[PDB]
Amino acid sequence: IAAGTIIAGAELTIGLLQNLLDVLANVNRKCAVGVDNESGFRWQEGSTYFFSGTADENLPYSVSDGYAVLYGPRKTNGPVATGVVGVLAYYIPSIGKTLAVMWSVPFDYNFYQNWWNAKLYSGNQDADYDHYVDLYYDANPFKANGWHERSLGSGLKFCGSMSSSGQATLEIHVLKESETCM
Template identity: 30%
Template sequence: MGARQSVIHITNKTEGYTLQNPSLHLVSGLCQIPLPTKLGPSECGSALFSKTGGTARGSVGVFTYDLYDTAADRADKKIAVLFSVPFDYGLYSNWCAVGVFDGETNSDSALYHKMYRTPERGFVRGKADGYDLTHTDFNVTIKSSMTNFSVATLKVEVHIK
């Protein structure tokens, strides 16, 4: 069946905001290259998640970053990103979702369930087809695009609206 990987590229295209304190919840798979711990304005970074060898599961999870406002010296909001690269393409497809949540939101199974299964409130979700998903909330716009391959590339950009 081949590799099931999520290569994630994150770019902070804001001025005055830092993405920090990443938190990850994996539903399946493992982390091969961890999320950057901090992305200041105009910085970018990458992470790699893969299926666990010998299992019939893919690479699936959700992560958050605190959206730290340097001028206000606080992080009232979080950005969240969901990625799903399944093992069985006969039953599932690649999906991604991005959103802005309050600062108390945890990266856990509840957030994963919300972003994968419930109606879109505070986030946008879509099948991976290479086209952009865009979500604007607070004063932040998150753009994402994901390829529909077993080694999927998910690009995430955070902008000021």
């Protein structure tokens, strides 16, 4: 008798663990990031950092005046239980500064929410974790509750918005400070 209830309990347990790992594998997170360059300067040397998740495509090397970044990052495949969270940065040699854009689309919406930010750092810098913790904690991010606007200095500003869901769209326009948004 007794080994039959052990094998039956083993099949019940793998029935639970199969459904658990198939749920965590089918819970999806992504952020379609559009950054639109109305700045009047060429961006170059495009770099990216992921705290969580990844892209399949490359970021483009450069954005000319009036062109856009259109970049699609997504969470890791399989039952990973992490969101998509990262930095995108470009150097702007016409002003000697690097624009960094951050997004955060979490896995668990009880603990976290969608956040985004952008800032214009001094010099040429690669995108890395020190920009993520700054753009997420040391400077005020935005809640994904519609459109927001902020100055960058050097005659620049941005306006942008993010959708509040796990399939997110982030849209930013980087503009001259003297001009109307969108």
